[model samples]
Target: MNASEFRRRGKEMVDYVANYMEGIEGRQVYPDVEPGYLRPLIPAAAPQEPDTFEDIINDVEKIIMPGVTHWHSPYFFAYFPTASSYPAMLADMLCGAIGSWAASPACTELETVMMDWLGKMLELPKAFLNEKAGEGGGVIQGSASEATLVALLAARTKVIHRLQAASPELTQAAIMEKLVAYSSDQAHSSVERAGLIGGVKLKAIPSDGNFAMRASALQEALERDKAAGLIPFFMVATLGTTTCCSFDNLLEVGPICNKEDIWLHVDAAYAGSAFICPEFRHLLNGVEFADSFNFNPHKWLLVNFDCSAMWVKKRTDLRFRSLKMWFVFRMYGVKGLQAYIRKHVQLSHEFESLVRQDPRFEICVEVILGLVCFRLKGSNKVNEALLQRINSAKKIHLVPCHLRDKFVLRFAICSRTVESAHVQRAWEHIKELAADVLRAERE
Candidate 1:
């Protein structure tokens, strides 16, 4: 299509989005498409000619929408919320239109500035905001996974630096097996994947009753490793772990890292959304002790996908230290950031309360702010059946997780469009589905 046709279709697309999001609940939360449903819908080979706008748009409903799980649907309560706010979406549109390389200072100066705005808003330490000269700061990674790898790389660099100084005979590859990373067993699997990429060992520490990692256990393991001459150079302390919204005791773990000189990287991908609320600030009380902190605004904040905000206490700690100072901190300052973060926390709490109150349902984990990990009570099989039913109904969508071998469901309330009615409808459908599942089991 020509530019003028593109303009007309863009308006149609916008209207389509608004209408779909608004009426999404009335439709099934999950699609009923079978495997290979779209195999016959398209040519086996790429088209030699350009496809018109009408041709592309016509296939969206038939090929795409039918197979989509509708993560943006208000009825969605599965994985951590992946947000798509108007402002972020608008920013993305322009970013795509301009299509500049973010790697350059000239191209990404604004992103750097925006990142500092995000950092201060999250109440990050000045040293981590890249505000001061000759110090470390924050950067935007594509995802928490990338940020985790970056942190591991930085920690490994520091460890290797010390090792090389102590013994000139050591090679970088020789130390790879000796290096190890730590996180609570409850932490996201990304920590393990990061270790794989870093070519080091990754240890998963057991947790306490709340599924929060205890510092005592970590220290014991560290001491054991030290005695064995194994290097424990890095720790991944999770906030809002994926399994059950569980948190690691950062207050206890952060200080140990300082004493042991181990790098502490906090993964608060989901729980960080709650940090916006002042009451939930205790979840991040030990963050100041962290070497780096990573959270996804795309998961909680109204920002769309591909924006994982990460901060480092010392800028040099980052393996790639190309972040500009004045571009980020000097512009947004501090106050503006406070407002943006605070709003996110407040919105989450509102969503949390709405998910509670139904007698038939029980919250699986404590709601910290923007997320709720809950499920039907009884056997793991029962919860699994309920989830299947919920998905089958297509009214409200929920995903399953194993918390201590028991099935639990996650409900992240991070959508800007989500309101009281949406929560109520989602809860209602969940209860209705669970009952249906139970009935089917008896028959």
Candidate 2:
């Protein structure tokens, strides 16, 4: 299409997006479409002929809307929120338009500056900022999983180099056989996947009653592994876990890792966003002892997906991750980003209070940050039945987790559009279904 046609279509597309966002709440949060719903809706393959812009736009509502999970809807309390903001969206358009790689000086330099800017916002140790003229800097990884894998690889390399220097006869294969990593059993599955991909043994250290991995458990494992002639090189600690948003004992874990010369990586993919606020910054203590840290702006900071922020006290491989982050930082100033974070946290507290007022429900874990794990006060089966009925009604969307032996629902205050009204309505819907389930059980 020519400039005039391109401009006209883009303008129309923006209007379409705006309308969807404004009216999203009216639609069901989850799609009811079954498998293979889209395959027969259109042609067997891409059309060989050019399709008019009108034809393509018309197909979106007919073919796509029915299958979409309204993630931005106020009733969406499923997985962690994906970012949604006008500023971030506008900046992203520019990023796509430029499409420049890190090889370009402008792209490389801008990313470097932005990473440092974000690092400072999180109050990260000076060692993690690129401006220090040390091997420390931040980058924008694709996800927390990639950050974990990258850190594991770096730790693996560092250990290999150290061993080679002391014993010239050591082969890469020999060292690989001895390398091991550690994380709490409550850590995201990505931590274990990183070890699998790295060809190293990853042990899930048992967490305490609070679901936090204490120093004592980790230390015992380290000593036992060392006695078995295994090289413990890396440990990943969680700031906010997936099941219950539990935090690992970083203050204790950090000192242990430092004393043992192990690389400590902190994966706070969700809760890390809260650290920008002074009230929640205490959760991030002991971060100074970490070799690397990461979180997802896409999950909470209003930046779109594929924008996870990561920092390393020792940067060995990070060039491409810095560029686009610079563009985002420039588009949304630090204060603007901080306000966005603060608002979600405030909204989370609002939801927590609403839940607390209802004695019929029981909080499975401490309401920390935006996620609140809770269930109907009864057996796991009753809560499960209530959840099924709620989803079947198709008003709000939520998911469940296995917290210890009980099945509990996880209500994450995810959508940027969520408010007190939405929280109240969701609680009412859940309570209504729960009452019905209990009455039927007694009958």
Candidate 3:
């Protein structure tokens, strides 16, 4: 559409969004109907049907709300959060139109000052922040994964810059081909992804009993890879690995990297916010050693979705890379993947039978595979209260659907290595939650 049309439509959209959040509490948080609820309602063919803005938007409530899951609902306790605020939304709509990188002065300048403040509060080394020599600072990124990636590329480029400054014959492609990066065994999978995307070899350093990456383990790999003529360009010190509370020995590893002229990147993505407090600032004790560092407010600081603020000792820049596709296809093979899927469907039936055993619930649909639809034997309001309480207690997170206007709950069996015991535990927890709902309603 043209500029004028966009301005008009944008206002309408803002109104729609404002009204949506205002009324979300009263509306059912979960969707009604099955997965493919649209094809039956709207024709697939691109037939010439004259439509206006009013025409389609009116259809939005009629056609859209029927199946859309209201994630912003007060009762929703499923999955990770997607933060929403009018302040953020307004900035985003403006950001969407700009269609580029950090171009605005407000955008660029504001980032610098704020990152300086952020660096000071985190007690990062003076060299890493803009306060010293106007050298280093931070930039906002989309994820910890991307920040790790950016760090790798900057290290890769830095290696080439130094080598080419003297040798002048060794190319960047060759340099990257010989580069190696290290991460703790407990590091986020994104570290591996960054290594793979940077088109370099990755060596996982074994972590100690506390799940922490220590000095000795990293030293062994550096020695081994060095003997084999590999150039260690970068290493990630995951300050707090998500799988377990673990911090890499940065004080030790950092100096080794500095001595070897390798880039030391610290990823405190999930744990950085806590470090702002004095008690936990010790966790980031080795910040002086890092060449770059990454953290996220989205996970801990209640910042909205998808902001991974990364601080670099210096400024720099950073792929799907298709190897995973080829490897999985060859490794899992079609039959092997199918076996896993068939196993998931098998669990669905197992859960179905478990649900059927309890007479308090009624099977909402004929369960044939991975997802089972069932509900309590009573009114929608009663089941609504039950589901609300279930989610409120934050156990056995199950979504609801309308099986022909009936509010029924949905349970999917898709977790890897899900045992009969897991299903039994979920069932017991759900039954317990259901009993409280019933008791609450009687009063």
Model 3, 1-443: lDDT tens digits are 88899889989998998888877655565575578778888877864966798978888888998687776653342324465344445555555666422445555555566566566656788877766456777767767889999888889888889988989998878787788998887678899999888899998888776557787888889899889989998999898565434567777888888888889999985567556555457778888878889987543333445667788776543311111222332444444544655665577688788889999898865553455777888899989988788776643467776643578787755433355665677777788988888787778
True lDDT of residue 244, candidate 2: 86
Query: In model 1, which runs have C-alpha deviations exceeding 4 angstroms?
Result: 1-6, 33-68, 80-83, 100-105, 167-174, 319-361, 439-443
What digit string (tens of lDDT, one per residue) describes model 1 on residues 80-184? 445555555555565567554545555466566666666766677777765544687777787789999998999999999998899989998888778878989
Q: Stretches of candidate 2 above 4 Å error?
A: 33-59, 80-83, 100-103, 164-172, 316-332
lDDT of 2 by residue, 1-443 (tens): 78899789999999998998888878777787977988898888888989987888778887888788877788878764455577666766776777755368876676678777777778888888889567788877777889999999999988898899999999999999999899998889999889999999999899998789998999899989999999999999998898988999899999999998899999996778777778778888999899989888666656557667789887764333344455555666777767766776677778777778888887777777778888888888888888899889989888998976889898888776777788888888888888889898787
The lowest-lDDT stretch of 10 consecutive residues in candidate 2 is 317-326
The alpha-carbon lDDT assigned to residue 376 of candidate 2 equals: 81
RMSD of each: 4.6, 3.0, 15.6
By TM-score, the better pick of 2 and 3 is 2
lDDT of each: 0.73, 0.82, 0.70
**lDDT: the better of candidates 1 and 3:** 1
Error of 2 at 151 (Å): 1.7
> How much RMSD separates candidate 1 from the native structure?
4.6
Clashing residue pairs in candidate 2 are 111-322
| Candidate 1 lDDT trough over 10 residues, lowest sum | 319-328
